[PDB]
Nucleic acid binder design. Structure first.
Ligand SMILES: [Cl-]
Ligand SMILES: [Cl-]
Ligand SMILES: [K+]
Ligand SMILES: [K+]
Ligand SMILES: [Mn+2]
Ligand SMILES: [Mn+2]
Ligand SMILES: [Mn+2]
Ligand SMILES: [Mn+2]
Ligand SMILES: [Mn+2]
Ligand SMILES: [Mn+2]
Ligand SMILES: [Mn+2]
Ligand SMILES: [Mn+2]
Ligand SMILES: [Mn+2]
Ligand SMILES: [Mn+2]
Ligand SMILES: [Mn+2]
Ligand SMILES: [Mn+2]
Ligand SMILES: [Mn+2]
Ligand SMILES: [Mn+2]
Ligand SMILES: [Mn+2]
Ligand SMILES: [Mn+2]
Ligand SMILES: [Mn+2]
Ligand SMILES: [Mn+2]
Ligand SMILES: [Mn+2]
Ligand SMILES: [Mn+2]
Ligand SMILES: [Mn+2]
Ligand SMILES: [Mn+2]
Ligand SMILES: [Mn+2]
Lengths: 96, 98, 110, 80, 97, 87, 110, 97
DNA sequence: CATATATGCCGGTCTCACACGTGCCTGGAGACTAGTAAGCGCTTCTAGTGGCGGTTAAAACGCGGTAGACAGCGCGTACGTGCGTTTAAGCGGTGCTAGAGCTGTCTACGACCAATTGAGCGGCCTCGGCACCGGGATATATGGTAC
DNA sequence: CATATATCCCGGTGCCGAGGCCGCTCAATTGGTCGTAGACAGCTCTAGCACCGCTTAAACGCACGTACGCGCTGTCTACCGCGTTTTAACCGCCACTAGAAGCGCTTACTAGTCTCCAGGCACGTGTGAGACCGGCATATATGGTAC
């Protein structure tokens, strides 16, 4: 036939679901809401980041912009943690 | 005979429908209205079944929201009964109406 | 030879896919190496934070599989996720049970 | 007679109940049909406008989603 | 001795301020409050006077907008006097919570 | 090397008269006595949100001075777009 | 030659400048030749449409010069501009004169 | 010295102003509000154009995208007039070059 | 108190969507190269800060009284319930085919280049529009009064 | 009707901000090159549509009557208007320097290019989570009647 290919975050939602709730599953509909959710927040952070870069006459979106973005975008507590897990993964990645 | 006092079933229905997540408008009457309104913008139009669902999900959500805000406006005027004027105040303050 | 940057950063979320989407998405002329790592990290966190509470909402409901309601209940009962998804509609989610006190019957025996 | 009336008194009641409304005025039902129509009009107008641009004759869920987004009523679980 | 009836000057004032565009909060008090609030987020901040003017413009615009919506809620309750509960419903239906 | 006057209770510089004037432009005729503290409360929440965002923009730009542009971007973010200060 | 692409389209608005701002603007890999012409035309139209109503307001106020109040009057009294700029604050615009009926003094034989 | 070069739409606003109202001028602040207006609507159209391209896996914002953008973004009679004025300038440009 | 009923729950039954193992294939990840964005030195000088005193407009306070908030009443009917009746939604169905959308060829068009030049900018100079003011013409609200 | 008190509207006056001349210079225009996006047409077969006839469930209409909206009244005090006194904003000036904004040097960063290698996919399965549900248990609303 023709096959056709359409990506998603479906795998990565499951890998995270097994970390936090190892014996719990998720309907396809609910997977769609998680998928909508990820793409949305991606668009938001990327966007804010995009503007941060532009406002400062800089051609690169660095982890810095992604952070300042997250700080503007996420509410008080959610932002604190976000900035932890983000800085952590950046630090872990450069050392390896 | 037996009769529930007026207000009691209404509260049961509030409890009932707040519990559930099923769509509360019948699908086909809705699907006909979507096609009807769509015709007035582009003719000979076809709808993915999913697109009609999406519209109906977003419509019911929007209206259920609006009734929440309509209810607060009614309570504000020391009433228990929602009235057109409540929907109008809600919509005016929301920014939808002028 | 060859191991995913996802692992280097200790992430389930695809750092590489994200780097692509940042470049492909016309957000800026260029995208730093940390940007997709950092972003993927935040995305994974929020995914966990929602799934954590949504998983809970399922147990409380005596169900092993998360349905949309569990995600709604999770998001609308958490102050900070509810602000983040203030302008969002979760299909097949319903609403939090919440009758206004003035609407409840007389009951003056307390 | 019209399709809008297919949105029945009892349907609108159910919607109100999920909204937490105990008592409903007789005039509400027509008012709500007016509000619902303006909502669908504004949304569908944009959805079709997206369809037109894709040179399609079928309105997709992706049209409605991008349309609902534009109007600030972002929907999750239809391809956001 | 001459004396206007309660509400005659109020209407007069409504007309006076709805004709004009001058800022209605005094400049120095507003600035002290901007510095005070900014200082609590970060110490040793300076402000371009335009950033204060922009902040005052945005604040009064917001508050005049909110008194309108408040007033409609007051009137909705068959009243003519705005009350905290009016402000609170306006802000709730706006989604400011 | 110079003492800056410690800033305290400046929300009270948003006086009763000024709040009343604001209500007048809003076509408010009669005002409860409880409105002026209620109002100060709301103003303060508003100003904190814009200034949080404004200062975030400044900190990112590695500046110590808050600019009119910083306020304008902050305001745009919050959905309260403002003409007449650049951008 | 060197003749402004503005002139080729019969526009006052700078088609070339707009072509730059579209490319430099993190908008898409490629920008057509039509896009900036079409865009500069719509910007020029809307500019004229409000400068007409704002000039009229200025002349009604016995003034040579358009000031923000004039733009505010122009914009808020026009149904379609008011909706376009529904979420916009015009510094030094003020508000439209509007007093709800129930606040106006009774017993007026005017 | 000799302050850096800052662009502005203020040259074309005066041009259209003289077209429409030849004996009418414009204040600094008014011109400022006009600049913010042009920058704002530019960004709105350019963004909705950027999304239309992307939603349809196109690498190019054409006049056709600007057009659809303008349909989505301007209200009724303003869109109709804008589209026509837009289409015209394209057509006129297409033949000139 | 007792009686009526709606809802909740159990344990069993079934079914179909989930969550798994299996290709298979494309979209990335190890090098690798090569030019630019931006970091970081140094300099200029803009405009942000802080302080003082003369003037006076705005703020604050207290007084007095009115008109609006509120609560209690009582009247009328617009509702909510529940019933018996009608209607059409939902469904499982068997076609039927527009068109979504995939692949493969071929311009047309848009980016990139990198010397050439006038559109647009920052200065600078300067009047004419308008801010501000006081004099006089109304316009209205309030209150004196005659009927 | 009479009068007191704001507001409007007028020219007159003086300041300074709009707007117009200038000369310098970037970013936009030319015109030639080259890579590929997308236009166009064919083909496939996904999934949208539509006529059918049951079977209920949900809509409908009706009729009862009750709790609630709504207009009236009367109380009372909170909020308005105003005169006096208090206060601190505003203005216009100082003097001081932080840091914003801009320039030139310089290099790690990233993008662009190949090659490869497994990560993510569409497929196909079979089976266990949950939908359904009969009938049984529990909670709660409702009215009777004797205090
Ligand atoms: Cl980075
Ligand atoms: Cl084009
Ligand atoms: K400075
Ligand atoms: K199809
Ligand atoms: Mn402090
Ligand atoms: Mn007992
Ligand atoms: Mn008992
Ligand atoms: Mn069970
Ligand atoms: Mn299995
Ligand atoms: Mn540079
Ligand atoms: Mn002093
Ligand atoms: Mn008293
Ligand atoms: Mn009382
Ligand atoms: Mn040129
Ligand atoms: Mn020139
Ligand atoms: Mn003059
Ligand atoms: Mn005067
Ligand atoms: Mn009188
Ligand atoms: Mn008489
Ligand atoms: Mn005059
Ligand atoms: Mn192609
Ligand atoms: Mn009856
Ligand atoms: Mn009545
Ligand atoms: Mn320094
Ligand atoms: Mn799969
Ligand atoms: Mn059952
Ligand atoms: Mn009882």
């Amino acid at each position: 036939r023709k096959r056709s290919r359409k990506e998603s975050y479906s795998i990565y939602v499951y890998k995270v679901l097994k970390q936090v709730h190892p014996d719990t599953g998720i309907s396809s509909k609910a997977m769609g809401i998680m998928n909508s959710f990820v793409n949305d927040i991606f668009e938001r952070i990327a966007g804010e980041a995009s503007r941060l870069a532009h406002y400062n006459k800089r051609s690169t979106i660095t982890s810095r912009e992604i952070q300042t973005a997250v700080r503007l975008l996420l509410p008080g507590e959610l932002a604190k943690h976000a900035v932890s897990e983000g800085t952590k993964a950046v630090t872990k990645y450069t050392s390896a | 005979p037996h009769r529930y006092r007026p207000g009691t079933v209404a509260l049961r229905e509030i409890r009932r429908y707040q519990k559930s997540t099923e769509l509360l408008i019948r699908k086909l009457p809705f699907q006909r209205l979507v096609r009807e309104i769509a015709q007035d913008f582009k003719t000979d139009l076809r709808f993915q079944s999913s697109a009609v669902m999406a519209l109906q999900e977003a419509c019911e959500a929007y209206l259920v929201g609006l009734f929440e805000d309509t209810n607060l406006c009614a309570i504000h005027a020391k009433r228990v009964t929602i009235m057109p004027k409540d929907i109008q105040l809600a919509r005016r303050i929301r920014g939808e109406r002028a | 030879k060859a191991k995913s940057r996802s692992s280097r950063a200790g992430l389930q979320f695809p750092v590489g896919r994200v780097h692509r989407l940042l470049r492909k998405g016309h957000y800026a002329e260029r995208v730093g190496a940390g940007a997709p790592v950092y972003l993927a990290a935040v995305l994974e966190y929020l995914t966990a934070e929602i799934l954590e509470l949504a998983g809970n909402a399922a147990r409380d409901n005596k169900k092993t599989r998360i349905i949309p309601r569990h995600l709604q209940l999770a998001i609308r009962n958490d102050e900070e996720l509810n602000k983040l998804l203030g302008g969002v509609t979760i299909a097949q989610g319903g609403v939090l049970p919440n009758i206004q006190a003035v609407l409840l019957p007389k009951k003056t025996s307390a | 007679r019209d399709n809008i009336q297919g949105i029945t008194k009892p349907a609108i009641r159910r919607l109100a109940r999920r909204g937490g409304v105990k008592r409903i005025s007789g005039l509400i039902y027509e008012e709500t049909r007016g509000v619902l129509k303006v909502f669908l009009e504004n949304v569908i107008r944009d959805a079709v406008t997206y369809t037109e641009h894709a040179k399609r004759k079928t309105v997709t869920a992706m049209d409605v989603v991008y349309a609902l987004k534009r109007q600030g009523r972002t929907l999750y679980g239809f391809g956001g």
